[PDB]
């Protein structure tokens, strides 16, 4: 009977942090979490050192060492970390479907835009940062107009090599 965090919303929300939207194709890949803390749901991941592991640290990704994919919302995750994949757990990375993610940009994004990754934190945006600290995920595009700090769905394809931007 818990009425806390009641906002009396006009209508239903759109999605959650890492939920997918149904479509026939999806590469979902099982990896093992390597970071000491968990990994959030809609997040980018790099290639681990365990030959099948992944890390949440993408500060050193390059066109030669591209990022691995994006985690998905699992909803059965050990109930000790709130919404995360705990250490030593199947990660369920996705690299082909359409997924809801979080926007980090001042002016927001619109339907068809490039997707730029900020290597410092691992956040998605519309344009390059400008100090050799951003990559462009070459095969990727948005699918929703959204403001700053809101959820937008994007279409992703990680087999296309990334592009470095200074």
């Amino acid at each position: 009977m818990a009425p806390y965090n009641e906002t009396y919303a006009s209508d239903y929300a759109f999605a959650y942090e890492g939920m997918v939207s149904d479509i026939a194709p999806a590469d979902i890949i099982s990896r093992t979490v390597e970071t000491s803390a968990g990994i959030g749901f809609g997040k980018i991941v790099a290639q681990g050192t365990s030959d099948r592991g992944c890390k949440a640290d993408v500060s050193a990704v390059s066109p030669t060492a591209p990022p691995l994919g994006i985690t998905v919302r699992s909803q059965a995750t050990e109930n000790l970390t709130l919404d995360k994949y705990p250490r030593y757990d199947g990660a369920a990375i996705m690299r082909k479907g359409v997924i809801w993610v979080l926007v980090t940009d001042a002016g927001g994004v619109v339907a068809g835009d490039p997707v730029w990754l900020k290597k410092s934190d691992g956040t998605f945006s519309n344009a390059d940062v400008g100090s050799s600290g951003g990559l462009r995920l070459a095969g990727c595009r948005w699918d929703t107009s959204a403001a700053n700090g809101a959820l937008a769905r994007m279409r992703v394809d990680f087999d296309v090599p990334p592009v470095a931007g200074a």
Binding site: D22, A26, I28
Partner: protein
């Protein structure tokens, strides 16, 4: 408020389709179909603003 002034057609209501199974994931579709609202007599509807 007469069927000759306003009209909205909804031929088919919401139904569900069988379950597709793909690699430890059960994808389930569900579809419907309707037609947009149609105001046939626009002089029989009036807006008053500023109340």
């Amino acid at each position: 408020n007469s069927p000759e002034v306003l009209k909205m057609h909804i031929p088919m209501r919401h139904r569900f389709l069988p379950v597709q199974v793909v690699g430890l994931t059960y994808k389930v579709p569900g579809i419907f179909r309707l037609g947009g609202l149609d105001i046939r007599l626009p002089k029989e509807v009036r807006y008053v603003d500023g109340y």
